[PDB]
Amino acid sequence: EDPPACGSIVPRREWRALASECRERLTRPVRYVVVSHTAGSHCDTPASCAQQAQNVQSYHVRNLGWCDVGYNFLIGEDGLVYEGRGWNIKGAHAGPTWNPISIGISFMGNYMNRVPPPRALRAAQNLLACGVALGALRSNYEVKGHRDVQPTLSPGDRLYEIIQTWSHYRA
Amino acid sequence: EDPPACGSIVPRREWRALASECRERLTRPVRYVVVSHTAGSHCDTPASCAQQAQNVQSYHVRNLGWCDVGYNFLIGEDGLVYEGRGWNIKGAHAGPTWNPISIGISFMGNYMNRVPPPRALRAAQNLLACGVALGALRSNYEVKGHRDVQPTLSPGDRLYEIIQTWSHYRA
Amino acid sequence: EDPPACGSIVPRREWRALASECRERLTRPVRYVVVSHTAGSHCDTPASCAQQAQNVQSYHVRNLGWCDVGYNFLIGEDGLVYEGRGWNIKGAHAGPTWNPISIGISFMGNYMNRVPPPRALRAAQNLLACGVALGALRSNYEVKGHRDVQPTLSPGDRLYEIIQTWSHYRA
Amino acid sequence: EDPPACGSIVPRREWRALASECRERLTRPVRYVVVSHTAGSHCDTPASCAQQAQNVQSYHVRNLGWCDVGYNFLIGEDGLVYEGRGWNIKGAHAGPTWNPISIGISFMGNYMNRVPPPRALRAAQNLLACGVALGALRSNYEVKGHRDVQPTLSPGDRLYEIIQTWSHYRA
Numbered sequence: 001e002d003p004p005a006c007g008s009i010v011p012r013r014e015w016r017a018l019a020s021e022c023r024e025r026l027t028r029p030v031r032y033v034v035v036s037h038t039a040g041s042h043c044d045t046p047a048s049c050a051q052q053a054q055n056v057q058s059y060h061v062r063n064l065g066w067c068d069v070g071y072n073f074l075i076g077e078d079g080l081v082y083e084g085r086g087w088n089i090k091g092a093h094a095g096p097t098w099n100p101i102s103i104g105i106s107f108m109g110n111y112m113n114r115v116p117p118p119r120a121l122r123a124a125q126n127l128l129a130c131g132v133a134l135g136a137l138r139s140n141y142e143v144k145g146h147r148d149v150q151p152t153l154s155p156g157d158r159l160y161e162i163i164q165t166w167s168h169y170r171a
Numbered sequence: 172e173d174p175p176a177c178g179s180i181v182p183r184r185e186w187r188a189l190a191s192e193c194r195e196r197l198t199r200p201v202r203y204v205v206v207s208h209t210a211g212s213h214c215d216t217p218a219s220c221a222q223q224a225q226n227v228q229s230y231h232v233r234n235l236g237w238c239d240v241g242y243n244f245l246i247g248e249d250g251l252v253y254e255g256r257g258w259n260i261k262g263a264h265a266g267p268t269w270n271p272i273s274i275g276i277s278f279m280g281n282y283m284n285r286v287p288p289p290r291a292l293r294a295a296q297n298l299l300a301c302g303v304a305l306g307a308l309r310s311n312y313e314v315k316g317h318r319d320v321q322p323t324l325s326p327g328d329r330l331y332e333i334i335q336t337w338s339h340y341r342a
Numbered sequence: 343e344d345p346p347a348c349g350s351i352v353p354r355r356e357w358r359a360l361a362s363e364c365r366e367r368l369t370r371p372v373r374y375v376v377v378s379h380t381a382g383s384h385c386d387t388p389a390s391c392a393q394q395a396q397n398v399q400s401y402h403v404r405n406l407g408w409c410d411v412g413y414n415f416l417i418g419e420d421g422l423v424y425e426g427r428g429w430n431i432k433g434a435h436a437g438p439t440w441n442p443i444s445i446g447i448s449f450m451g452n453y454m455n456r457v458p459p460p461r462a463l464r465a466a467q468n469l470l471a472c473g474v475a476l477g478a479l480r481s482n483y484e485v486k487g488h489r490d491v492q493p494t495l496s497p498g499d500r501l502y503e504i505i506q507t508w509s510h511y512r513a
Numbered sequence: 514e515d516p517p518a519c520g521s522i523v524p525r526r527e528w529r530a531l532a533s534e535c536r537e538r539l540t541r542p543v544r545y546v547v548v549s550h551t552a553g554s555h556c557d558t559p560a561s562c563a564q565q566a567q568n569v570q571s572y573h574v575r576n577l578g579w580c581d582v583g584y585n586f587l588i589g590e591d592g593l594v595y596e597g598r599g600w601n602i603k604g605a606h607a608g609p610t611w612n613p614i615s616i617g618i619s620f621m622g623n624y625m626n627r628v629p630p631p632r633a634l635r636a637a638q639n640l641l642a643c644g645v646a647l648g649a650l651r652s653n654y655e656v657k658g659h660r661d662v663q664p665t666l667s668p669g670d671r672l673y674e675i676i677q678t679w680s681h682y683r684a
């Protein structure tokens with residue numbers, strides 16, 4: 001209901017996203033945020049991360065047959081947030097119980113033995129705070145690791161350990 | 172433990188800043204924002220921009236003898252904001268009349284004949300939105316171009332025309 | 343030696359509960375039962391207790407912003423049990439230590455200056471025997487008063503005095 | 514450059530507190546203040562009020578097995594503030610979401626149909642101003658009633674009505 005700008009998000013067109021065919025909406029405010037890792041290549045420049053977002057969406061859309069990249073937002077090691085399905089569209093990232101009731105954000109990389117740099121972590125958390133400001137997320141949203149809702153190594157041991165320390169984390 | 176503050180700002184230690192010796196505090200909520208360009212080299216990756224921030228500060232501190240880089244914040248073409256003097260400390264970027272009453276943000280590069288990429292412009296807006304949320308800048312803050320308050324070409328013809336289109340800009 | 347059937351419980355749909363957003367599961371057989379009072383208005387008819395359960399849930403969901411009414415079950419003075427989060431879902435009634443290991447049942451009304459009627463006490467006892475029969479509760483489950491595990495007057499002096507006499511109460 | 518600022522809080526030692534065993538810290542400046550009532554009896558002389566602080570602490574530590582009395586501060590009707598976990602240690606007064614991000618002040622008494630006397634309201638307001646002066650609370654901290662964040666009658670209808678008029682109150 002409120003107006004103002006918040007965070008910086010690389011818009012779909014900027015990373016050359018194929019148009020989205022998704023139409024199923026999320027009911028705001030969303031209560032849950034599920035953090036995953038793509039378990040794909042990482043990137044650390046805006047040019048390489050735009051390409052990585054395009055690659056992940058390519059895989060989801062072209063190979064998995066989904067209506068769009070599965071994540072609502074992707075986070076690059078360049079410290080930028082990449083617009084996925086966005087705040088209003090149900091994503092495909094955490095199974096049928098979780099997809100309809102959460103926002104999925106994914107760090108582009110494999111964090112089993114590596115951590116995302118502080119800039120990626122800041123972008124992620126700042127994105128969530130913007131979500132709250134926009135009324136897209138509940139002021140009391142809860143952040144979970146992908147492994148807290150599905151059997152998976154995601155978001156990677158190292159990254160999971162870090163999100164466990166976030167303010168809104170509730171396993 | 173505790174949430175990283177808004178604006179996804181690269182902290183001064185992250186860009187290896189020399190310690191500041193500045194002491195003068197700004198009285199918040201600050202009314203003005205002055206946008207400048209560094210008229211120096213630009214950079215388009217976190218690694219090159221952290222180095223550029225370091226270079227700009229080195230010049231101000233080592234050569235000009237200042238207590239810190241003069242800008243409150245620097246904006247890189249990597250789409251990230253670099254912490255300079257910050258929200259609370261008076262900068263040295265717009266002269267004696269403006270320094271005490273504004274936050275000076277400087278785009279790293281020379282914008283006389285080229286524009287900052289959208290990600291750099293987005294980073295600048297994210298930052299200002301964050302200053303308002305923080306209480307650092309008043310809600311109805313006013314943006315001024317550096318040339319509007321000191322005799323200079325900064326922030327560069329091309330960046331100057333863009334800022335003139337900002338809702339908070341005031342001639 | 344095989345699964346039977348108990349439970350004279352009023353289904354959520356019947357009391358027109360808002361849908362639950364809770365998903366964390368309790369581990370059966372649950373060892374503990376925490377008895378609280380809603381400290382609010384009591385009701386002595388199915389029509390009024392269905393609305394009272396709705397009001398209590400409204401407070402938790404609408405005002406406190408929770409995923410569901412915090413209790414696993416609510417007990418009315420009409421002698422009926424109202425389905426809250428139920429046997430399988432972690433409630434929100436006794437804090438972080440006790441919620442994961444207990445079923446929280448709450449008597450609807452204030453039992454500081456009142457005892458619940460015999461029919462409400464029978465409802466509660468019958469519910470717990472049902473939980474043991476279903477394997478939801480350990481056969482030797484321990485009953486705690488809310489005030490024994492959190493700082494509160496709950497479940498009210500009168501009710502507290504009553505539960506301290508129960509076979510299953512464990513100081 | 515003046516050492517003494519605000520304060521005049523009855524130190525633990527003085528109300529004869531059992532040594533705290535809590536070590537989890539809050540991060541200053543703290544954004545939220547949650548006002549509760551102890552829900553029991555009041556005290557209106559320094560002698561009585563100090564006995565009560567001991568009593569509340571006794572319940573939390575001896576009975577509930579807590580590391581210290583749960584509140585950061587207690588307000589006596591004797592017009593004095595009683596030191597609890599203090600400005601820096603995470604309390605146990607508003608649940609797992611609020612505890613790590615707020616300062617819990619509890620008026621010693623039950624204010625459902627009795628309002629705290631002016632000297633207790635002054636004590637409380639002065640402590641908060643003190644908090645801000647010290648950097649312990651943010652200048653724009655928000656006050657919430659206990660019942661705004663937890664299912665409880667605390668801080669009492671009478672005291673709740675009064676705090677909703679406070680400058681910093683925000684439901």
Ligand SMILES: CCCCCCCCCCC[C@@H](O)CC(=O)N[C@H]1[C@@H](OP(=O)(O)O)O[C@H](CO)[C@@H](O)[C@@H]1OC(=O)C[C@H](O)CCCCCCCCCCC
Nearest residue numbers: 139406434435436437438441605606607608610662663684
């Ligand atoms: C610490 C001791 C406090 C003393 C308690 C005194 C007794 C009176 C209150 C009843 C306690 C009961 O609520 C306990 C409870 O259920 N706790 C939290 C939690 O338990 P878990 O086991 O951790 O899941 O279960 C849930 C998960 O984490 C959660 O619901 C519970 O408490 C919370 O964390 C939720 C917050 O209390 C409410 C959050 C939003 C409040 C709405 C305020 C709106 C203002 C807007 C703010 C921007």
